[PDB]
Design a protein around this motif. Sequence first.
Motif, mmCIF file in Angstrom:
data_model
loop_
_atom_site.group_PDB
_atom_site.id
_atom_site.type_symbol
_atom_site.label_atom_id
_atom_site.label_comp_id
_atom_site.label_asym_id
_atom_site.label_seq_id
_atom_site.Cartn_x
_atom_site.Cartn_y
_atom_site.Cartn_z
ATOM 1 N N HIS C 50 31.672 -26.140 3.453
ATOM 2 C CA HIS C 50 32.371 -26.643 2.287
ATOM 3 C C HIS C 50 31.943 -25.880 1.043
ATOM 4 O O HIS C 50 30.836 -25.344 0.975
ATOM 5 N N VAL C 52 31.518 -27.309 -2.545
ATOM 6 C CA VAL C 52 31.478 -28.640 -3.128
ATOM 7 C C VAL C 52 31.349 -28.496 -4.634
ATOM 8 O O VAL C 52 30.577 -27.661 -5.117
ATOM 9 N N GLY C 122 30.713 -33.802 -6.557
ATOM 10 C CA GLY C 122 30.545 -33.925 -5.129
ATOM 11 C C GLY C 122 31.821 -33.839 -4.334
ATOM 12 O O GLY C 122 31.788 -34.029 -3.117
ATOM 13 N N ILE C 124 34.598 -31.885 -2.440
ATOM 14 C CA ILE C 124 34.766 -30.571 -1.841
ATOM 15 C C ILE C 124 36.111 -30.007 -2.267
ATOM 16 O O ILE C 124 37.082 -30.747 -2.454
ATOM 17 N N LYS C 154 28.727 -25.402 -5.361
ATOM 18 C CA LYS C 154 27.712 -25.047 -4.386
ATOM 19 C C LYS C 154 28.316 -25.070 -2.999
ATOM 20 O O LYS C 154 29.066 -25.983 -2.657
ATOM 21 N N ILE C 156 27.917 -25.654 0.932
ATOM 22 C CA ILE C 156 27.129 -26.621 1.684
ATOM 23 C C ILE C 156 27.630 -26.638 3.122
ATOM 24 O O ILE C 156 28.832 -26.781 3.369
ATOM 25 N N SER C 158 28.386 -28.191 6.541
ATOM 26 C CA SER C 158 28.635 -29.506 7.094
ATOM 27 C C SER C 158 27.814 -29.708 8.360
ATOM 28 O O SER C 158 27.549 -28.773 9.118
ATOM 29 N N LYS C 159 27.393 -30.951 8.579
ATOM 30 C CA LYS C 159 26.745 -31.312 9.826
ATOM 31 C C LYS C 159 27.722 -31.859 10.845
ATOM 32 O O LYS C 159 27.294 -32.340 11.895
#
Lengths: 159, 61, 211, 58, 172, 60
Positions: C50, C52, C122, C124, C154, C156, C158-159
Amino acid sequence: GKSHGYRSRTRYMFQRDFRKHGAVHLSTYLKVYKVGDIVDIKANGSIQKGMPHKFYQGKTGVVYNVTKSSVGVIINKMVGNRYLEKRLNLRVEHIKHSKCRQEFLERVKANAAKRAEAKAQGVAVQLKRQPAQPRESRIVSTEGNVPQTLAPVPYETFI
Amino acid sequence: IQAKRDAKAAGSYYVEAQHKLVFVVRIKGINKIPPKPRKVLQLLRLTRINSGTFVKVTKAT
Amino acid sequence: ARRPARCYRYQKNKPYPKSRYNRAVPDSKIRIYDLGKKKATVDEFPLCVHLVSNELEQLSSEALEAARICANKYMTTVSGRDAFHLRVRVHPFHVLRINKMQQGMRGAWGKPHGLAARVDIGQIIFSVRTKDSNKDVVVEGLRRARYKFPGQQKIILSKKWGFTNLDRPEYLKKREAGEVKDDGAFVKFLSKKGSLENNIREFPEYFAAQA
Amino acid sequence: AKSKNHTAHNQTRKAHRNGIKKPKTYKYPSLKGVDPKFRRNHKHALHGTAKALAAAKK
Amino acid sequence: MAHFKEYQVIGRRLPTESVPEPKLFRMRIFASNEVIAKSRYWYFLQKLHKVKKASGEIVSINQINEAHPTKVKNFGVWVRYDSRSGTHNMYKEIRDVSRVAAVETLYQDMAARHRARFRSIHILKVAEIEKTADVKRQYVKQFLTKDLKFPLPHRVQKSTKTFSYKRPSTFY
Amino acid sequence: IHEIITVGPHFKQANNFLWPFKLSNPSGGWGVPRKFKHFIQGGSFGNREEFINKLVKSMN
RNA sequence: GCUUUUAGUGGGCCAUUUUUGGUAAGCAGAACUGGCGAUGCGGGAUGAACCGAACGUAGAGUUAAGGUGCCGGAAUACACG
RNA sequence: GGUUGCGGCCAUAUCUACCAGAAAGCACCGUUUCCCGUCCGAUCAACUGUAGUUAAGCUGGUAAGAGCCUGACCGAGUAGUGUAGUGGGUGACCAUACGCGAAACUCAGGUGCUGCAAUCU
C-alpha cells in the motif's frame, strides 16, 4: 428570502420512525387523561390535525382541559428573561403520559408504607432517598485468581 | 492496619474503604470562568482564590 | 488557467459532490483505476503493498492521474505489464469551486473548478498486489508516486494476501481447506451459516475430510 | 455603509442579570378556556355545596 | 517525569451478579507517586481490556524496591514511542544500578536523542541482561572489558571566589 | 472535628456552620512551575489525594 | 416575593472551539462562552483583547503568570544527553 | 392443550420451499325463490348444513433458510466527543490529563406472547 413557516425545519421531527409507519395503534385512543396529568408531547406525523408547534415536541406539561378528541396542555416557554405559560389544544395522538410521575406515585405508596411499618416496629423510619454512596472496604481473594501481569503492547501495522 | 496485614497473611488483598470526605481548595482566581463551573463554585462556597471547604463524597458531589 | 494545488490542499469545505444541485462539474482527469494484470487470480499475487496517506487533505484528480501514469510506467518498464495489479483506492468525488473574476465579493459563490479525493490520515491511496520476488520493484513504483502528491505518504507492506482481508497464513489455511473458491479477480468464502443444500453446490472440495 | 446583521451575543448574560423567572403557579388556577359545558356545571356544583355546607350551620 | 518509583498496581473490573471475583490484572508502573501510578494503570489497562476507571477498582498498590540496590546491572529496555510522524518500537540498553535508575535515564535519553516526552513513551519491558555477550549495543560493551581503567582529563575546579590569584590548573 | 472526619448524620449542618477557610498561599510554594495543569501532568489542579495535606498545612 | 418610575443604549470588536462564502486577508457573515469597550496592576521588551489577577489607604508575609550571566530583583545551580 | 369471536403489543408474529393435522370449531363447499348486487350468484346478497372435503385457507413442525428480535470483556473502551495546558508540529493535524462513549463487524441464542368470552375427546 428567509422562510419561517409553521412547519419549517421539521424534516426529521414529524417523520414516522422507520418501519413503524401507517396507522397508529389503538392504545393511543384508550388512555384516560385527567385534569392534572403530566404528559409528554411527541407529535404523530400521520395526524395533521391538532399538531403542536415544533417547539413543544419533547416538552412536558400538565393537562388543564379535557375535551372530545384532544386535551389542553400547559407548557412553560422560555422567552426573554421570563417564562410564559402556554396553552395547547392538542389531539391525543401527539401525547402520552409521563413515566417520571410513575416514578413518583409508586414511590409515594412505598414511602407511606415504610413509614407505617416502621411506626409499628421501631421508628427511625429513614425513608429519604440517598445518592450513590462510595464503596465499602472488602477483602478480595487471590485463590484461583492469581494476578496476570499485563505489559504494554509493541507497535504493529496489520493492514 | 491489621486488616491490611491479615489480608496479606491470608493470601488476599484488603482494599481500603473509599474516602467519604474531600477537602477542596479554589486554585484559580475570579476572572474568565465559564458559567457552569462558576455556578458550581458559588454552590461549594468557594468564592475567592485559596479558599477551602469540606465536601461529603457522593455521586452528586 | 488552473490554480495551484495549494489553494485546495486542505479539507476546508464540507463535501460538495456532483449532485442534482451541482450539475455543472468538469470530468475527472483520472478515469481508470485498475491497471496491470487485473484479470489475475488471488493465488497469483500474494504480496500487497500500500501507499498510505499520513495527512488529512485532498488529492486533486490531476495528481492521481499523474501518479497513476508514473507508477504504471515504472512498474511496466521494469517488471513487465502483467506482473502486478495496481488499484487506485480513492475516487475524486468532491467538487472544488473557484470565484473567477466591477463587483468584488458581492455574489462570490464560485463555479466548479475541478475534482479532489478527500483523504484522511491512514487512508491507502494505491494498492499493488504482486508476486513476492517483484517486491522492491513495486516499492520503487510507489516511491516515484510519492512525488506527485502533496503531503506526507508512506509505503507499507500489507500482512494480508493481496486484496483480500485475511492474513497470508489464514488465507493459506482456507486455501488448503476447501473454504476458498475462485472467482474472476477475487475469491468467495464458505460460511458456516446458510442453506446447507446449496452450500455444497458451491464448494464441492470441502465436506470430505481434507484438501 | 454595511453593518452587523444579527447576533445573540450578550443576550443570555442580559437575561440572567434579573435572573430568568418562573411563572409563579397558584392554587386554584384560572378556568379560562376550559370547556364551557364543564365550566357551566361547575358553577352549580360549587354553589350547591356551599348551600349544603351553610346548611350544616343552621 | 521525576525521580521514579516502581509500583505494582493490581486492579479488576467491579463484580456483578454474573461475574464475581473478576480476573485481577496486574501492571508494573514507573511513576513519581501513587496518584500518577493509578492513572497510568488505567491508561494502559484501557488499552488492553474493556474497562475504565468507572467500571473498575484498584485492588492493591505496592512499591517495589530493587532487590539488590547496589549491584551494577545491564538492563535491556524495549520502548514504544511516538515521533512527530509515526510510532516506532526501540531497543536501548542501559547499564545502571536499579530498574528505577535505568528508567530515569531512559526518559532523559529519549527526550534528548529523539525529543520524546513522558506522554509519548510506553515502556514495554525493562529486563536485566544476565550474561555478557548478550549485550547488543556497543555503548554498554565498552564497560564490560577486563580491567577497565580510564582517566578524567582536563579537570576544571569550581571556584568559591570571583577572582583567582594564581592561575587555574587543569591537571588530574 | 468528629462530625467532619467520620462524616456524621449531621455533616451538612456542621459543615454549613463553618465559614469557608480563607487559606493563604503555600509557604513552601506550590512545588510546580505551572499550576494550571492536572496533578498527574505535574500541575496543581485535580485530585491530589493524600498530598492535599501537604498543600493545606502550608496554606493554613 | 411584588410594584411603580426613569436614565443611558439600540455603530461594536477580539480570543478558544464549532462553522459559511472566499485562493486568502489585521476579509465578510453566524453559534456558545470568556474578555476589551468600561480596566488600572504583575508578565508577554514594546501592544485594547493573550497569560496571571481585577483595584479604599498602609505594614508584614506568601505566591501567580513569568523568570534567576549582565543590563535586572533572583542559582555563571545540580543531573543526563 | 386445540379452535372460534373480539382484541392488546404489532415480524421472536414477516417471507420462500416442503411435511402433519384426532376431535370440535373454522374453512372450502351445495342451491338461486326471496332482499340485494353483478358483463357473469366469481366478489357481494339470500337459502340449507342438506350432496362432499381436509386438497387449499387456518394451525403446527422442518430448514448449517433469507428477514427480524435479544445478548455479549466480539469489534472497541475503537471512532467520535465535553473540559485543560505558555503541550507537540511551519502547517495539516496529533498526542496527553480528567470524563462520556457509538455504529458496522463477529459470535451465540430465539422464531410470537397474552387478555375477555365460548366451545371441544
